[PDB]
């Protein structure tokens, strides 16, 4: 049973759903452990409850009958999760993340080089939408000619057709790489082994589709919302980053705490318990609202303000917590750092369009509402 999580807050505007800080403050102050009769869900907003739901799989299972949304990795609890996680993790080593940085830098340099003389840019079409698709295509090892945005657009049934077309495209590339191994994700998934078990070629195609669904639109949203913040939240932050070019990672971590909305994951209660202060029964569904708990003043001082120097920022739960903690988190942080650093090198100052209207430039997405357009005036020094 697909649970329509959109019906819990019932937002009055796309703009509110895009940045629901008023609703987070209401739930944290008045209703932090909230039973929603219409969806038959429990809803938790406080940092210590959200963290417990995400990680304590003995009590809060990822593999229940009801959900908020090809290996089903995200739907497995330990012990069955260990093999799937280990085989996919073979493509996300410390060595690969080190080797990816100069490749991702090249891609960012080319995207920014295309807009370097622009008086005005559109973050979405010029940067946030193409960049994570161009990156994942390079990291997969796709032929240079195919270097792909189309796929994830369509991968959003339209869905049956698109998945069958991706499969026919990639299946012969995996077979080819099995005989012709290179430093790319597909080659690392071919060589992966757990207790003598390996992926089949078909499983590797599915693994790449899971990585596309996990890592493209999420990263696009995170980048667009970071640039949104520089225009609309702390308008002095961009200047601070220009003045000290080592601050990019701190800025990325604060934009993942402050401007990624809405982050929520569901679990199914596995055993009766009152760990969240209320009696729950086996089969109950709990939604953990990570974006809300990222503004819990018990963990984050001055939580409704941008502060890239807040020493707790690295504790945000935008990537989850526990066994399912985002496999892509290092890559996501690297992509956001590299695109921000390339942008800072090109542009001395950015300004919003006085006439930009948010409501007409938001569309429904898996995370709530996403920018369709984000204009800015840019300057060079």
Binding-site annotation: residue ranges: 74, 81, 85, 265, 267, 324, 326
- Kindly state whether residue 74 participates in binding ligand HEM, applying the rule CB under 6 A: yes
Question: 92-131 mask for ligand HEM (x: CB under 6 A)?
Answer: ----------------------------------------
Residues 372 and 361: beta-carbon distance below 8 Å: yes
User: Residue 7: which region, alpha, beta or left (left: phi > 0; alpha: psi -120 to 50)?
Assistant: alpha
Identify which of residues 88 and 378 has a Cβ nearer to ligand HEM in the complex: 88
Q: Which stretch binds ligand HEM (CB under 6 A): 14-22, 111-119, 237-245, 312-320?
A: 312-320
Question: 219-238 mask for ligand HEM (x: CB under 6 A)?
Answer: x--x----------------
**Residues making up the binding site for heme b:** 74, 81, 85, 265, 267, 324, 326
Q: Output phi, psi for 244, to 5 deg.
A: -145, 100
DSSP state of 360: G
Residues 124 and 372: beta-carbon distance below 8 Å: yes
Interior CA angle at 62 toward 32 and 331, to 5°?
Answer: 90
How many Å apart are CA 337 and CA 34, to the nearest integer? 36
Please list the residues that pair with 265 across neighbouring strands: 288
Identify which of residues 370 and 378 has a Cβ nearer to ligand HEM in the complex: 370
Identify which of residues 42 and 378 has a Cβ nearer to ligand HEM in the complex: 42
Identify which of residues 268 and 318 has a Cβ nearer to ligand HEM in the complex: 318
DSSP β-ladder status, 285-288 and 41-44:
parallel
- Kindly state whether residue 318 participates in binding ligand HEM, applying the rule CB under 6 A: yes
For ligand HEM, how many residues bind (rule: CB under 6 A)? 24
- Kindly state whether residue 85 participates in binding ligand HEM, applying the rule CB under 6 A: yes
Task: Please enumerate in sequence order all residues whose Cβ is within 8 A of that of 35, keeping only pairs 6 or more positions apart, or say none.
Answer: 41, 42, 43, 278
- Kindly state whether residue 152 participates in binding ligand HEM, applying the rule CB under 6 A: no
Segments of 20-158 assigned E as strands: 33-36, 41-44, 60-61, 120-122
- The residues binding ligand HEM (CB under 6 A) are 54, 62, 73-74, 85, 88, 210-211, 214-215, 218-219, 222, 260, 265, 318-320, 324, 326-328, 331-332
């Amino acid at each position: 049973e697909v649970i329509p999580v959109t019906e819990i807050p019932k937002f009055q505007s796309r703009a509110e759903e895009f940045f629901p800080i008023q609703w987070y403050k209401e739930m944290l102050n008045n209703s932090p452990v909230y039973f929603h009769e219409e969806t038959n869900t429990w809803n938790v907003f406080q940092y210590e409850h959200v963290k417990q739901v995400l990680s304590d799989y003995e009590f809060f299972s990822s593999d229940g009958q009801r959900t908020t949304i090809i290996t089903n990795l995200t739907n497995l609890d330990p012990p069955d999760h260990r093999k799937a996680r280990s085989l996919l993790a073979a493509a996300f080593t410390h060595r690969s993340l080190k080797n990816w940085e100069p490749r991702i830098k090249q891609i960012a340099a080319d995207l920014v080089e295309a807009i370097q003389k622009n008086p005005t840019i559109n973050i979405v079409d010029d940067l946030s939408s193409p960049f994570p698709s161009l990156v994942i295509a390079d990291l997969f090892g796709v032929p240079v000619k195919d270097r792909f945005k189309k796929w994830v657009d369509i991968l959003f049934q339209e869905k049956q057709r698109a998945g069958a077309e991706y499969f026919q495209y990639l299946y012969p590339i995996v077979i080819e790489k099995r005989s012709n191994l290179s430093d790319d994700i597909i080659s690392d998934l071919i060589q992966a082994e757990f207790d003598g078990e390996t992926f089949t070629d078909e499983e590797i195609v599915h693994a790449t589709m899971l990585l596309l669904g996990a890592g493209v639109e999420t990263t696009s949203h995170a980048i667009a919302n970071m640039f949104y913040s520089f225009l609309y939240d702390d308008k002095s932050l961009y200047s601070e980053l220009r003045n000290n070019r080592e601050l990019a990672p701190k800025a990325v971590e604060e934009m993942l705490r402050y401007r990624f909305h809405i982050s929520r994951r569901d679990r199914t209660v596995k055993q009766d318990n009152e760990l969240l202060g209320v009696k729950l029964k086996k089969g109950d569904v709990v939604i953990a609202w990570m974006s809300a708990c990222n503004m819990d003043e018990t963990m984050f001082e001055n939580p409704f303000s941008v502060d890239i120097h807040r020493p707790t920022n690295k504790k945000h739960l935008t990537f989850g917590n526990g066994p399912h903690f985002c496999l892509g988190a290092p890559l996501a942080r690297l992509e956001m750092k590299i695109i921000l650093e390339a942008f800072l090198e090109a542009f001395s100052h950015i300004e919003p369009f006085e006439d930009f209207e948010l409501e007409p430039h938001l569309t429904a997405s898996a995370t709530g509402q996403s920018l369709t357009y984000l204009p800015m005036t840019v300057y060079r020094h």
